[PDB]
From a paper:
Although the CTDs of EcmrR (residues 112–269) and BmrR are highly divergent in sequence, their three-dimensional structures are readily superimposable. Both CTDs belong to GyrI-like domain family, a well-characterized motif that is adapted for multidrug binding. Dual site-binding is also observed in the 1.4 Å EcmrR CTD crystal structure, wherein both sites are occupied by cetyltrimethylammonium cation (CTA+), a cationic detergent in the crystallization solution. Y174 and R220, which partially occupy site II in the absence of ligand, gradually lift up as a ligand binds and as the bound ligand gets bulkier. The two ligand-binding sites in EcmrR are approximately symmetric about a pseudo-two-fold axis of the triangle-shaped EcmrR CTD. A glutamate residue in each site (E185 and E243) dictates the preference for cationic compounds, while the lack of a positive charge in the tetracyclic sterol head of CHAPSO is compensated for by hydrogen bonds between its hydroxyl groups and polar residues on the surface of site II and extensive hydrophobic interactions in the ligand-binding pocket.
The MerR family of transcriptional regulators activate suboptimal 19–20 bp spacer promoters in response to myriad cellular signals, ranging from heavy metals to drug-like compounds. Here we report one crystal structure of a multidrug-sensing MerR family regulator EcmrR and nine cryo-electron microscopy structures that capture the EcmrR-dependent transcription process from promoter opening to initial transcription to RNA elongation. These structures reveal that EcmrR is a dual ligand-binding factor that reshapes the suboptimal 19-bp spacer DNA to enable optimal promoter recognition, sustains promoter remodeling to stabilize initial transcribing complexes, and finally dissociates from the promoter to reverse DNA remodeling and facilitate the transition to elongation.
Numbering used by the authors: 112 to 269
Amino acid sequence: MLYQAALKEIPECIVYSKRFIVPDFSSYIKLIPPIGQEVMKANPGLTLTTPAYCFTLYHDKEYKEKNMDVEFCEAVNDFGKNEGNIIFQVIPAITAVTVIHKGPYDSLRNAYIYLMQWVEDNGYLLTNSPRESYIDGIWNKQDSAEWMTEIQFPVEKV
Ligand SMILES: CCCCCCCCCCCCCCCC[N+](C)(C)C
Ligand SMILES: CCCCCCCCCCCCCCCC[N+](C)(C)C
Ligand SMILES: [Cl-]
């Protein structure tokens, strides 16, 4: 796939979120559906933002694929009440270099490789946790070649 870096300012947002140490990506994503179900039950009237912004924060300090520190986030228009370890928080504004990963998730690492190289080549520094923003996927497209996930590296120019 031919990744195409873009540079953008991402404003702050309010999210509901849950943080996990996960064995691998498949194990992690099985934990995601219950989060929305439980937070919505506990906060009638909670509204997702339009457009949506639904993303994983990868909090590890190095590249990893197993035993990962991940935080699932989904943007809402206003705060609700925390439900268990599901917590509302403000995710701060960042300047990000981004690429779109088309297709299934087994090759997501290629987008991270690409962005790590771009940051080095163009005189930037990664300054906060990468975000993995889910756009199109099994919820709306059964042709997995048409899934779309945006990888966002928070950066500052050196
Ligand atoms: C000079 C710095 C060298 C590289 C810094 C990399 C920091 C790593 C950022 C957090 C870990 C990202 C893990 C993403 C895994 C995503 N997939 C499971 C989908 C592949
Ligand atoms: C029988 C085959 C079972 C397939 C299970 C499919 C479950 C799909 C549940 C999707 C949850 C996706 C969460 C990402 C949120 C989507 N938005 C980006 C639109 C907010
Ligand atoms: Cl320069």
